[PDB]
Nucleic acid binder design. Structure first.
Ligand SMILES: [Mg+2]
Lengths: 1337, 79, 98
RNA sequence: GCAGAGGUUCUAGCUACACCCUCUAUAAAAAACUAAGGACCACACGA
DNA sequence: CTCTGAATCTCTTCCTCGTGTGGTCAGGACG
DNA sequence: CGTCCGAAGAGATTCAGAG
């Protein structure tokens, strides 16, 4: 219907145009009669008639009298709904500043005038006079002059000089100033002054002035002469409550504002003394401030119940504001709620639903069908028929529920699968029945959990619900390719009990014709459910070109595993049902079924497996009892040993051999050892103790105990959750987190001591409070993630970009956390992968890596695969399908259009509730060892030493893959050589953790140059070996006398001539910094790789993810080499040491300040490339993006957040993190304007500058260069081109103020904009409509 | 009756244009007197449109050309 | 708490804060995001416009469903008009281009 | 059946979301029928 | 003496839906 | 019968160290 939305500063004439009148009486209504006040806030003439086409007097009461006002009262007669849009204005006697521009953080009014805000709101509050047009005076146009100084000026500036005060005075200033003149005046100060901070302030002023010379806005408009009022129906009298008519809302603020305005009018016409008039003007200013934004001053005006009364800005911001309460998400009709019920008889495509709920929700449909069939002539009679619940109504109801999906909806819809469609099955009752499989997807319990049901109305709505939202269409969660409808708790236990074996069970040994015979034997009761019997199966495989071949063989198995064979579809092999079939096995089964058979066979197989699991779990009778949890017989002796050990430790501490700290550490260690021992004893008693024969003498099998079956199967439970039942509960921590010295030895099968239960409830309360805080933190993170997203949809199909990220299996010192098979699956490569054979196109350039390709990758032993990343995509206002990859919910490429920003945000934020809050190098296995970027010189010991700093051991096996990766500290000696085969279990590199060696690159004679004993390095004594060792004094500790001279170590030969670096004219000098112990004195020869000086030397929870996504700089940021070159030092650590890096070829205009306490891994004789770390500690993403590139920072953040998610046992595909990061760094800064219109200081969206410079480079012109910058989610979201999106997120007042100053027009084009407006969403079915609309323009 | 729309989306590889075309088909069936080509089995319009798409005889191109022909004989009705 | 049509609120959000008072459940911001994640732009649009606050839209949808033609007359949410009036009343002209 | 009135009932009924018939300045042979309002703050609880 | 970095001060939220209750400008008398 | 009175981080704002 309508084009883009624009926002601008409201001109007073525009306000007059808006208003259909002018309110004068403060009074709203009469109580004598609910008729509105003649000139009050509720008024008929100003805002239209109260009743539908009736006047106040009632002279005209029919529709034919529309468009004519009354006579005695002169009120227009029209619809009452017109009263919801007619506005009015208040003619303020004295102009009042708008608080939004006044008390803004940047202070629009103050910044525009380039004067401090203290002065501004001093002159607003009538306690200091500004000097309008000072002219031929000492005082200037922008000058403060309080009462006494004003009198001092007045008594001797009695000329025509005038210095107005108040908001009128600032209006005078704003009128006097010319915006263009100020811009051209400040341009030369911008071009001249070299101060960074000062120029930053000048640009901020220039931006404000430019945003007013471009937009049709006048600076004077900020001061508001007329105050608009809302339509009365938007701020009504509130329900009568028996005539009480009372609520502290806008009506009250408007009443007080009108009262003050009338008082000012009376005083102005009365010519009251200036002090009283000034006080009343201050009161009016405070009233307008409270009206617009209450709480933007010290005292928030308070209504009844002594609470801040909601203002005109409290209803546009916050959770209860109009945006997030009525636009972003709004209540809906055709909706009902009830507790949920299992109802296993249902299929996941359908759900149970009460008759009353179907009758109430589908009332219009029932009325329509009744009218069509003629059962009721009219809607009114049909409605009565629905009330009578006549039997004919139920038959009609069954017709409108045949194929009408409903949207089951749980309240905390964390992710996409929170709401799913279902075909309602009419059930008698009052509880909605939810299919058991989708409970895991819903994260829904059956403990009073309630979920709303919504009824799609239009054919488009029902049809898209059926096509997309059906549980049949949602098998794989959007977070990862793993199935989401997997048998979760009880059916998995039934399958696990089904697929086991006794070594001697009834009916074991005989051969079975097939699964039918197995079912016949089990049901007849003459053969046990799980007995090892050979069966004949017709296994079907599709190894042909889609054709299924039949293989018949006698596979040894059990009866229970044979039962499942008739359930599985034809394509699945028998090797998947021949195991114990725990939770992981069933998940792998369902994934293979989805990837082989498809979707419909997977749905049918899931339903059948659910049926059989439930049925045979019922037949199993897998109960729980006291005898089912066994106490280890060795638990008593383990407890006795632990008590003896703690007694010995306490006795040692009493003597004084061990102090408190080491005693505490020893006790904790020995109690942990006892806990591990008792846990192992419990597991042995729970899975090994079972003794059962084989018709022979004796045999031992895996236990059939109830708790072991319910825990090992993965049905429900874990290692700690089973330890806390039979074994020692373990050391339980205090509130602060420090461990109680004495653990809760007693388990839950036995009783607990009162102190033991006190520690237990300490831990439980800590966990409950942690969960209560963590769910709120995760909700906030999900909101931020969604809103930094929601403008990113798959707009194209391909971009032809060769860029991407090189996907490599992640190694964090240990084993392979995620193999490349599960890391690149579903993503489209960027360049051809090759096997060890070179120039081999194993996988072509632009083929999606499905299961077959990934399986081929593993057997070809690939190491690193370059893949097209969503970050590297060059598509504007979206990304292409190929750069994203698989949908992760359907086995194909992402559909052109589907919104992936919201999918990624929900996938990231869903596990937020599941998160938390608080040497030597040894080879592991056999394999080759090669080093990357390594410089080594053979020493006299035959070992290997490293000259580079980022040498990093990668362990290559005989397959060519990197089994292990270890970081090599500088100077660490390597026992083995390059490419030397090593056997797992022996250390290859070892070093002193508290020592930084200065090992020499080339052996030879070293002369002590600039070494003075007494001034630079004092010869300290030694009380340990008897031979003194030279220790270099610290620069801060040593005086300036020994500080000016530069310590150095010159290398010479036997003839005394200097030795130069191989290939470098610079001699191999070495600098010794402070605190460097030099055992080797002068005249001592040094071999290669010999140490010269022995220089001596976190969170992973939800807050870590929040910091990572907000791009928070760490408390101790790691310094990275901004430029590549040699290192030089400047100041003598005068408070802040400065470091300068100069390249061999280029200039050195970069200087960095480094505090003394920061450890430096770099010296002044080595070459460091750009991005190499200098200090130690966490590195901010901003520096990584600036130096190492966008791909490097994307990889860093993806790896960090995945490692955070790894510890909690939750897996999220890296594409979600990648797209969120792409949305994070969508802003760019133009370092050189070039020929583009963009200014240098200006930062613009990367899409804008990319489009502009690609257009400029399309022809002979040269495009402008830019510098991309990374900013946090909560900062990228507000800093967006859409004002209506940033306003809806956070800081609504600031965003709206900046938009109104800018005059910027929102073009919609984002999911959340079109949601707020209420039009089609450019995400799914609306994407085609939006692209048609664009192509029609 | 139908449970899943898989074969339909292998017929129409968009999963989004499928909804639009079947919605147009359902609109033709309800608002107009159009007879569904697959005979119904006591099925609603929104599912019989998906049945029509499943057999492959109804999609965006056939629907567009069919409505274009209907418009053509609509001009030709008055000669 | 099942409901089809009932009395509406000040902002004209139809469900009227569901309780004893006959109400519809708040299709909150999380559920809107969930539909956005799906390829849902018709059910979301209908349930954020013609099912909640569009007075002309609501009346037309009711008349259409009782007629038998489940056709959405989109219109515009009245909550957005309320927001426009509230932002204008602050003194910030926010309008639409035709 | 769109601007009004009348009719057999029951003050009033003209599509008000709304139910039957008449015509453009005139009132009755006729059974099924009728109503279109409604906030915030706190508490407790559930998931 | 004028900015530099740094301490200080101020703003801006800090989940998402339900179900029961209860309390809320309060003009007041005079032409 | 009507009518007039913790907490956590970011950014602006001082504010300060050093030549
Ligand atoms: Mg539950």
């Amino acid at each position: 219907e309508f084009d883009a939305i624009k926002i601008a500063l409201a001109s007073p004439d525009m306000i007059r145009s808006w208003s259909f009148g002018e309110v004068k009486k403060p009074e709203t209504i009469n109580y004598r009669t609910f008729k509105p006040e003649r000139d009050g806030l509720f008024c008929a003439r100003i805002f239209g008639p109260v009743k539908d086409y009736e006047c106040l007097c009632g002279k005209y009461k029919r529709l034919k009298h529309r468009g004519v006002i009354c006579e005695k009262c002169g009120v227009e007669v029209t619809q009452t709904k017109v009263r919801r849009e007619r506005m009015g204005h208040i003619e303020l006697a004295s102009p009042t500043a708008h608080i939004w521009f006044l008390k803004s953080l940047p202070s629009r009014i103050g910044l525009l005038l380039d004067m401090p805000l203290r002065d501004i709101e001093r002159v607003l509050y009538f306690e200091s006079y500004v000097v309008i047009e000072g002219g031929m005076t000492n005082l200037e146009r922008q000058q403060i002059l309080t009462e006494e100084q004003y009198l001092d000026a007045l008594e001797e500036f009695g000329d025509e000089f005038d210095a107005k005060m108040g908001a009128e005075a600032i209006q005078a200033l704003l009128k006097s100033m010319d915006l263009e003149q100020e811009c051209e005046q400040l341009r030369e100060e911008l071009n001249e002054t070299n101060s960074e901070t000062k120029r930053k302030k000048l640009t901020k002023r220039i931006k404000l002035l430019e945003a007013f010379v471009q937009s049709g806005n006048k600076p004077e408009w900020m001061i508001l002469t007329v105050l608009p009022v809302l339509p009365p129906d938007l701020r009504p009298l509130v329900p009568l409550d028996g005539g009480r008519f009372a609520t502290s809302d806008l009506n009250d603020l408007y009443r007080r504002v009108i009262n003050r305005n009338n008082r000012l009018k009376r005083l102005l016409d009365l010519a009251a003394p200036d002090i009283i008039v000034r006080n009343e003007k201050r009161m009016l200013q405070e009233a307008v401030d409270a009206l617009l934004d209450n709480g933007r001053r010290g005292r928030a005006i308070t209504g009844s119940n002594k609470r801040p009364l909601k203002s005109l800005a409290d209803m546009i911001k916050g959770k209860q504001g109009r945006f997030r309460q009525n636009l972003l998400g709004k209540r809906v009709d055709y909706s009902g709620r009830s507790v949920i019920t299992v109802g296993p008889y249902l299929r996941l495509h359908q759900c149970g639903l009460p008759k009353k709920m179907a009758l109430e929700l589908f009332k219009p449909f029932i009325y329509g069908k009744l009218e069509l069939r003629g059962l009721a002539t009219t809607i009114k009679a049909a409605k009565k028929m629905v009330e009578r619940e006549e039997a004919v109504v139920w038959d009609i109801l069954d017709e409108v529920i045949r194929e009408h999906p409903v949207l089951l909806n749980r309240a905390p819809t964390l992710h996409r699968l929170g709401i799913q469609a279902f075909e309602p099955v009419l059930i008698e009752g009052k509880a909605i029945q939810l299919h058991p499989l989708v409970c895991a997807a819903y994260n829904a319990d059956f403990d009073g959990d309630q979920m709303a049901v919504h009824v799609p109305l239009t054919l488009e709505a029902q049809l898209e619900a059926r096509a997309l939202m059906m549980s049949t269409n949602n098998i794989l969660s959007p977070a990862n390719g793993e199935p989401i409808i997997v048998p979760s708790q009880d059916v998995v236990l039934g399958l696990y009990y089904m697929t086991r074996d006794c070594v001697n069970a009834k009916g074991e040994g005989m051969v079975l014709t097939g699964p039918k015979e197995a079912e016949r034997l089990y049901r007849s009761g003459l053969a046990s459910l799980h007995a090892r019997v050979k069966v004949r199966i017709t296994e079907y495989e599709k190894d042909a070109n889609g054709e299924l071949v039949a293989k018949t063989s006698l596979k040894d198995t059990t009866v229970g595993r044979a039962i499942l064979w008739m359930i599985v579809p034809k394509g699945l092999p028998y090797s998947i049902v021949n195991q114990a079939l725990g939770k992981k096995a069933i998940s792998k089964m369902l994934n293979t079924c989805y990837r082989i058979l498809g979707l419909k066979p997977t749905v049918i197989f899931a339903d059948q497996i659910m049926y059989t699991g439930f049925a045979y779990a019922a037949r199993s009778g897998a109960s729980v009892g006291i005898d089912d949890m066994v106490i280890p017989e060795k638990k008593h002796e383990i407890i006795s040993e632990a008590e003896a050990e703690v007694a010995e430790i306490q006795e040692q501490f009493q003597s004084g051999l061990v102090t408190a700290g080491e005693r505490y550490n020893k006790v904790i260690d020995i109690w942990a050892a006892a806990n591990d021992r008792v846990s192992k004893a419990m597991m042995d008693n729970l899975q090994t103790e079972t003794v059962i024969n084989r018709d022979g003498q004796e045999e031992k099998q895996v236990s059939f105990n109830s708790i072991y079956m319910m825990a090992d199967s993965g049905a429900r439970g874990s290692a700690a959750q089973i330890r806390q039942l039979a074994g020692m509960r373990g050391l339980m921590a205090k509130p602060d987190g420090s461990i109680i010295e004495t653990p809760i030895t007693a388990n839950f099968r036995e009783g607990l001591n009162v102190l033991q239960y006190f520690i237990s409830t300490h831990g439980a309360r800590k966990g409950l409070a942690d969960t209560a805080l963590k769910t709120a933190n995760s909700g906030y993170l999900t909101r931020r993630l969604v809103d930094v997203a929601q403008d990113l949809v798959v707009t194209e199909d391909d971009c032809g970009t060769h860029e991407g990220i090189m996907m490599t299996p992640v190694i964090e010192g240990g084993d392979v956390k995620e193999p490349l098979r599960d890391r690149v699956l579903g993503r489209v490569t960027a360049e051809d992968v090759l096997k060890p054979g070179t120039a081999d196109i194993l996988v072509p350039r632009n083929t999606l890596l499905h299961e077959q390709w990934c399986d081929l990758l593993e057997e070809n032993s690939v190491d690193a695969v370059k893949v097209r990343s969503v970050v590297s995509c060059d598509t504007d206002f979206g990304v292409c399908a190929h750069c994203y990859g698989r949908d992760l919910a359907r086995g194909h490429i992402i559909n052109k259009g589907e919104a992936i920003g919201v999918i990624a945000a929900q996938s990231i934020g869903e596990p937020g509730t599941q998160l938390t809050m608080r040497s030597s190098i040894q080879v592991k296995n056999k394999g080759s060892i090669k080093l990357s970027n390594v410089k080594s010189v053979v020493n006299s010991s035959g070992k290997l030493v490293i000259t580079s700093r980022n040498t990093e051991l990668k362990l290559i096996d005989e397959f060519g893959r990197t089994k292990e990766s270890y970081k090599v500290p500088y100077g660490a000696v390597l026992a083995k050589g390059d490419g030397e085969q090593v056997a797992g279990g022996e250390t290859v590199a070892n070093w002193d953790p508290h020592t930084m060696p200065v090992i020499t690159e080339v052996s030879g004679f070293v002369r002590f140059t600039d070494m003075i004993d007494g001034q630079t390095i004092t010869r300290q004594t030694d009380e340990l070996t008897g031979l003194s060792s030279l220790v270099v004094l610290d620069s801060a500790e040593r005086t300036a006398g020994g500080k000016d001279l530069r310590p150095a170590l010159k290398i010479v030969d036997a003839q005394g001539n200097d030795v130069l670096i191989p290939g470098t004219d610079m001699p191999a000098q070495y600098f010794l910094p402070g605190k460097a112990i030099v055992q080797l004195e002068d005249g001592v020869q040094i071999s290669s790789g010999d140490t010269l000086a022995r220089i001596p030397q976190i969170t992973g929870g939800l807050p870590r993810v929040a910091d990572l996504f907000e791009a928070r700089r760490p408390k101790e940021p790691a310094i990275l080499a901004e430029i590549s070159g040699i290192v030089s030092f400047g100041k003598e650590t005068k408070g802040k040491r400065r470091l300068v890096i100069t390249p061999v070829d280029g200039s050195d205009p970069y200087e960095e300040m480094i505090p003394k306490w920061r450890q430096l891994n770099v010296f002044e004789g080595e070459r460091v490339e750009r991005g190499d770390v200098i200090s130690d500690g966490p590195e901010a993403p901003h520096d990584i993006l600036r130096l190492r590139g966008v791909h490097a920072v994307t990889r860093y953040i993806v790896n960090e957040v995945q490692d955070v998610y790894r510890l909690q046992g939750v897996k999220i595909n890296d594409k979600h993190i990648e797209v969120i990061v792409r949305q994070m760094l969508r802003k760019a800064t133009i370092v050189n304007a070039g020929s583009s219109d963009f200014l240098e200081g200006e930062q613009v969206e990367y899409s804008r500058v990319k489009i502009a410079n690609r257009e400029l480079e399309a022809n002979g012109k040269v495009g402008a260069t830019y510098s991309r910058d990374l900013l946090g989610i909560t900062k990228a979201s507000l800093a967006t081109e859409s004002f209506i999106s940033a306003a809806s997120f956070q800081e609504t007042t600031r965003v709206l103020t900046e938009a109104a100053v800018a005059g910027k027009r929102d073009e919609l084009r984002g999911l959340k904009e079109n949601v707020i407006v209420g039009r089609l969403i450019p995400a799914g079915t609306g994407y085609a409509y939006h692209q048609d609309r664009m192509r029609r323009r | 009756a139908r449970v899943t729309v898989q074969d339909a989306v292998e017929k129409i590889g968009n999963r989004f244009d499928l909804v639009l075309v079947a919605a147009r088909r359902a609109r033709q069936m309800q608002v107009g007197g159009k007879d569904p080509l697959v005979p119904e089995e006591n099925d609603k319009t929104t599912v019989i449109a998906l049945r029509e798409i499943e057999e492959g005889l109804i999609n965006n191109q056939i629907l567009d050309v069919r409505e274009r022909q209907e418009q053509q004989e609509q001009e030709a009705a008055e000669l | 708490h099942a409901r089809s049509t009932g009395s509406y609120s000040l902002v004209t959000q139809q469900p009227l804060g569901g309780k004893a008072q006959f109400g519809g459940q708040r299709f909150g911001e999380m559920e809107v995001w969930a539909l956005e994640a799906y390829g849902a732009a018709y059910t979301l649009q209908e349930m954020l416009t013609v099912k909640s606050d569009d007075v002309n839209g609501r009346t037309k949808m009711y008349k259409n469903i009782v007629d038998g033609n489940h056709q959405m007359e989109p219109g515009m949410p009245e909550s957005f008009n309320v927001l426009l009036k509230e932002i204008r009343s602050l003194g910030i002209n926010i309008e639409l281009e035709d």
